[PDB]
Symmetry: D2
């Protein structure tokens, strides 16, 4: 299929068919009027310049704003790239350079990018890593805490301790803490299934890092910029200021711009952004702030969560409803007690939806990924929610078949 | 300093000062009317979309065009990124995947990017590699042929054989040819000093690769899209069709878009581009074709070469004039016979120029990098050339001092 | 201190003080009469020869014997080195070469050697890895099953499933099974604390390997040659034939000789031994066979286990008694219920023992390592056991202080 | 074939056929009476002991002697292994640990061992590296100076400058000098063809290392212990004290013992030897000293060199005669002016010799390796030399055919 154009949460194919976008670099929705104008005004003045002798204003303005909105009060610096991948690659460099150490710890289930560094940190789609090794050396992966498929009787405190214990094992065997430059964590894993780490777990890792001189880095490529109902996913957690943070194309409404924002002394251990993409980004941040999208995601998120929890009541194929902001994973299982994945039911849901004007896809075969643009109007949100309920019903009753 | 706007080969700072741009993602010049309009028209329809269920038209059109204009007649496929760095990273993957081998050979003096893969292939600025290792494994660097500082009495044939002999040594010691996935070469090194490899040398390497099943890959990030007076720098060489080729932001007039273009069977061994940047790229290629910029670079290049060779006659500090298209390296030496670098004279030249409205910079301390936009009007080209002649004179007579 | 000489399980310092050896390349005891004579007879004929045109007989004889006694019935080949380290390094090569794959999986807690390959596989003493990285690429570590410090209520089946689940996580995230050349496991970890893997766990890993084309390799450097009461530690497990197996200096009574013994087709994927050390090894194997040391270790092992389990009854500082053959780990804890390690009590035990003519040391601060020579006479075994009981008493009553 | 026994420079197969040994861990010859007795006396007292609480005397004595005889006057420490491979692996660790840097530079043509570290440093037989990668990261290879196949008109000074220039290129491109822990060099390459580096070349590299804080390490596994007519091959060079040096099994007459001997402060940056092998080594060093083998190799070496240079006069297939001590490479070429290798003539020479009771082999197809035991009696040396002359004649006249 072929998309012609889009606006807000609506996609329009070449034959004029309309769909509701449930899928992300689209926090502010498609073709926001302010972003369009920023791109157009800025292309008229300056598409590109090699930075040697000169600076541009959108760049310096954007840079100053991101330093401020970044989590915590410690002074920051900002380094621009073109995508998540190259930002996460840079995090490795910044961390190594600053600490003089070489190991990096990253999580199983994570997705950090497709360049050799960020790919090596990743733990999602090995297909991505097949036949392309060796990868970057001195990287270790540890398991990300899973709150759904747990052991019988486990509290959140059990799950936090158990996983923090897995975290330490490498450090108790072959990986010297004093030679680890940083830990990189998605405060909520996206490609992993919209899996959020328990609060205590994160405090343990954080305290561990500080106690052994290891930088604490986060990836907010998918979960930042209001997606969770706070500005930054890490703000779902109590009093945590990371040393380094990555941001992706969401920054510029899907135009290719990225950043790393870090504590000044870390960033001095070792560039400037596309001006048209910087324009788009200033407009984008303005829309998030003035349209109150952080708050909107929180409020609609809580709404969505209730709507999904109620659908779950009539629809046992819904194993788990996870939602923080308009950010959710609706995990389908063949049976509530075994939690067996039902990739087949999920495929059926998205094809039904698709067929009724709702665009959505999955993670890990069986989890629906719900991340509509934050600007989504309540009417469309409700249409889409209804179509989904319907989809569950059709599938429940065997009324859905994929060609 | 701060740039406000630019058009063609003219930069304009915030105080309305004008400069002539001698510096590259600017083949078609600044703010070309067609590129501006493509960006603006396309932002109105679609800034970004996640590609899952949908394709966009600019993407498919761009893709088809690049398949065709790419060097050789073998069917091609095209894979899009956001920059040179991530394209060169991909070249590694594509090569490995296809061949099932792991080693990669790259050249000393090269610059391929700043992500961990392309950075590891690079051989220019170790500063870039300081404190950030380990780099990517299974990469070997070999020396790039230097035609200026050669041994007494050396012909182009001597230089070609000598360097091809260095090339083979690894293969005769620790690097098994049958385990090398590819060789990546800039047909003319850019960051290296605008150093072009001798024709015979390139045939040797090429034939070597084919004879041992090694993919032959080129980087045209800096030297492609008409910069040399042919479409692709590799076209300066007789009957060479690479297996893989990288292209950078020049593709979209400095908007963040890249590509790898390769033989179909290689590319099947293992994405889609930003639509606004794809729009910019279609406009950009159209300008190169209809404005005859390939031919223009050839013709102005030959003009520039004569103008520099004549300046050299009155200015012995000019050791070497290298030029293929409007693509040149004007290498300054303290003495014609010793060839000692004179980084100091070069710094003085650029500061004089700067002060007389000409923006230019250096490579390796002492080489002037001449790569103005291809659309440069002859009047400005001549102004800039004159200012340079002047600069040589001032510096010759000790009239130039840096604060 | 300085040792002058030794015989059986007795060490004698330069001042004629006698000690009982509880510490291993000493399966057959010190200075066995047959080993001494083999060394002496063979030194008279041939200390060393470069193998080019010639073979030696001890070498071919030793080779044929080890092929036969190795676990399983599949034809084998034997490749000789000088130590465990270089045998485990070779296992990596053999595995890679044969499979055409690159990743290797090894266990946390393991000790495989001190050369860069075997060191990278290791998971015991990071001190060993401090400041010497980067290590060898494409190695992943997983946790070795711990049967003592487990979760409340865990059966052996829980522990087996839980740990096999940790094993799979890498394979479910970033490590492609089809690109893993082998898994290397100590059927009982030695440096790790004399920790034996549960039977079901091992069947799972084994079946996993076979199902994904991964070679199953074992380290018997510490636990082979009758140490466990079977010839090979892997024989404690039902019907398991490894693809590769490493053996260390025990082979030649601590003379420097090692081997890898593997399935013929694996070993053809890609040397010969010191003749004097091969002589020592033939004598050594003869002593193990005719003196019935496999059986002796089993019988004395069961005796030792009862004697330790009874000491545990009066000595609660003994948290865990682990023993398979004359191969044991007597783990000291500050409290039976918390299992807190008591490194301090252990240090006190060995100093008491030492002072009463018993040489023994620890693993992980708090575990006594019991591995006397297999030939140990029952009288000495009993003396040493008694001294230990005493040591526990002294320490219990605060009668022991380290200078 | 099968060797039964040997003594001095004589090998004896199982059928009582005698051969003269021209091939090395055999500096003192086969079965020297003193070495045999040391092995036998020491096996009677102590074959092996785990070093924890105890030291042995042969170990401390050997250690003290090697500290003293090592090149230079700076205090030294000695660390023992079982072979060249594991000594060269350790050199990497020692160097890294001390400097806090990670890169290592090693030479094309070199052979340092077969464990993953020393193998990665090696540059001789890629077969050894086929299908076993990835190798150890952060290693770079540079070319070893070749004095035979040089460019027309080159002096030793040209060859020294040219090669030192190749040495620097990496450092001028991608390899930061301040991040290189050491350079490891064979002062005369053995497996490479008995190729000795020019004096000036070595001073340049040495001075380079000192000027950039890089440790200067040498391999004397093949060329040490009097092989060159000085104790250590590095003593062929003016006033050079290495930071680290490796020694192999020659130390103990082919018993498995190795060492690293280094400047004390380097060695403190981060074991003990087999007592029977340490005994053999003390005897071995005594034989070298009292039998004047350093001097003998010098004198016989000069004799051998004249005898080969004269054979060359009647035998043009001898391209190059290289000899320093009883250490030589007699390189066969198809034509004196082209220097084409004649692997075929070499194979014929060794088969003729073999057939007339002389054991010798080749390097690189066409170079005869001459390294008889140093104790060789002049009568046998002369027999063997004569047989070789004969061999050249037979081959010259087409009288030699391999089955």
């Amino acid at each position: 299929l072929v998309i012609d154009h889009a606006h807000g949460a609506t996609l329009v194919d070449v034959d004029g068919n309309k769909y509701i976008d449930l899928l992300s670099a689209i926090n502010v929705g498609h073709t926001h009027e302010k972003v369009v104008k920023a791109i157009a005004d800025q292309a008229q003045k300056l598409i590109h310049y090699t930075p040697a002798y000169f600076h541009h204003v959108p760049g310096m303005e954007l840079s100053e704003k991101l330093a401020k909105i970044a989590p915590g009060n410690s002074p920051k610096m900002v380094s621009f790239g073109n995508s998540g991948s190259d930002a996460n690659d840079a995090i490795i460099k910044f961390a190594r350079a600053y600490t003089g150490r070489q190991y990096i710890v990253s999580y199983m289930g994570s997705y950090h990018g497709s360049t050799y560094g960020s790919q090596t940190l990743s733990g999602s789609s090995l297909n991505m890593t097949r036949k392309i090794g060796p990868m970057l050396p001195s990287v270790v992966h540890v398991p990300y805490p899973d709150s759904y498929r747990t052991y019988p009787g486990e509290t959140e405190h059990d799950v936090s301790l158990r996983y923090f214990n897995e975290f330490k094992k490498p450090f108790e065997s072959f990986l010297p803490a004093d030679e680890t430059a940083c830990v990189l964590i998605e405060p909520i894993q996206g490609d992993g299934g919209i899996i959020k780490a328990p609060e205590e777990y994160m405090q343990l890792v954080y305290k561990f890092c500080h106690e052994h001189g290891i930088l604490f880095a986060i990836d907010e490529v998918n979960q930042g910029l209001g997606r969770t109902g706070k500005m930054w996913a890490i703000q779902q957690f109590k009093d945590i200021e990371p040393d380094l943070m990555s941001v992706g194309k969401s920054l510029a409404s899907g135009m290719p711009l990225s950043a790393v924002i870090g504590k000044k002394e870390v960033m001095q251990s070792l560039t400037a952004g596309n001006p048209v993409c910087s324009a788009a980004s200033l407009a984008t941040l303005d829309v998030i702030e003035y349209e109150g999208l952080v708050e909107k995601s929180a409020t609609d998120g809580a709404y969505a969560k209730q709507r999904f929890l109620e659908m779950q009541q009539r629809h046992p194929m819904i194993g788990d409803v996870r939602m923080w902001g308009l950010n959710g994973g609706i995990e389908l299982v063949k049976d509530p007690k075994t939690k067996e994945p039902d990739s087949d039911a999920a495929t059926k849901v998205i094809y039904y939806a698709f067929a009724h004007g709702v665009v959505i896809i999955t993670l890990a075969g069986n989890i629906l990924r719900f991340q509509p643009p934050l600007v989504i109007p309540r009417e469309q949100l409700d249409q889409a929610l209804q179509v989904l309920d319907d989809a569950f019903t059709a599938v429940e009753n065997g009324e859905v078949t994929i060609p």
